Amino acid sequence: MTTSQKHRDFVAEPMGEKPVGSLAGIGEVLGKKLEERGFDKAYVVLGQFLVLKKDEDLFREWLKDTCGANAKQSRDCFGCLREWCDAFL
Amino acid sequence: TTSQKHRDFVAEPMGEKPVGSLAGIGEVLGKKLEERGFDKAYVVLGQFLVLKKDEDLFREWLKDTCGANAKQSRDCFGCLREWCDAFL
């Protein structure tokens, strides 16, 4: 397994009310910028991922534009949501 | 009360279900949702979640987007709310 433990923990169970910082790739710096834009729970970011029809390009560009995520951070966040959805949606 | 359509939706993961599997979303509403990019139930769930599950704002968005009346938007909200309580 090449995913982070943090990815594995997120994808192992429903997310409920977990904060945005529970997503892989979302450290404290990105999580603060997300919360300040209203994306305060992980499920709100899931919401954006789903409204963008799970499209990697659009979602990763949106994360960059919204909180300054770099390529690795946006890849990790996308992959964590994609695998969560495959498991639970 | 709830419809069997509601109960069937809230009983399981929605996967790739079409937007018309949502309670309240009949043929006319579904067409208009699909025309605007909301072709699958999970895209509408997405909008519900971006709006932080807010009943008033989601039901207003649905009316603005596809013309849902009050019963249709009530039905659609309630099915997404109960689905999230079971699966999210």
Curated annotation (Swiss-Prot), chain A:
Q: Matching Pfam families, A to Z?
A: SAM_BAF
The observed outcome of changing K64E is: Enhances histone H1/H3 binding
What happens after mutating S4E? Answer: Complete loss of phosphorylation and mislocalization of EMD in nucleus
Modification after translation, per record: Ser-4 is the major site of phosphorylation as compared to Thr-2 and Thr-3. Phosphorylation on Thr-2; Thr-3 and Ser-4 disrupts its ability to bind DNA and reduces its ability to bind LEM domain-containing proteins. Non phosphorylated BAF seems to enhance binding between EMD and LMNA. Dephosphorylated by protein phosphatase 2A (PP2A) following interaction with ANKLE2/LEM4 during mitotic exit, leading to mitotic nuclear envelope reassembly.
The record's section on InterPro entries has:
BAF, BAF_prot, BAF_sf
Organ and tissue specificity:
Widely expressed. Expressed in colon, brain, heart, kidney, liver, lung, ovary, pancreas, placenta, prostate, skeletal muscle, small intestine, spleen and testis. Not detected in thymus and peripheral blood leukocytes.
Q: What does the UniProt entry list as the effect of changing K41E?
A: Reduces histone H1/H3 binding
Q: Tell me what effect the entry lists for K6A.
A: Complete loss of LEMD3/MAN1 and histone H1/H3 binding
Outcome recorded upon mutating A12T? In NGPS; shows a dramatic reduction in BANF1 protein levels indicating that the mutation impairs protein stability
Impact when changing R75E: Reduces binding to dsDNA. No effect on histone H1/H3 binding
Outcome of swapping R82E = No effect on histone H1/H3 binding
Q: Which UniProt keywords apply?
A: Acetylation, Chromosome, Cytoplasm, Disease variant, DNA-binding, Host-virus interaction, Nucleus, Osteoporosis, Phosphoprotein
Q: What is the effect of changing R37A?
A: No effect on histone H1/H3 binding
Residues where Phosphoserine is found: S4
Q: What is the effect of changing K6E?
A: Complete loss of dsDNA and LEMD3/MAN1 binding
Per UniProt, what is one GO molecular function of this protein?
A: double-stranded DNA binding
| Consequence when changing L46E | Complete loss of dsDNA, histone H1/H3 and LEMD3/MAN1 binding
Q: What is this protein called?
A: Barrier-to-autointegration factor
The record lists the organism as: Homo sapiens
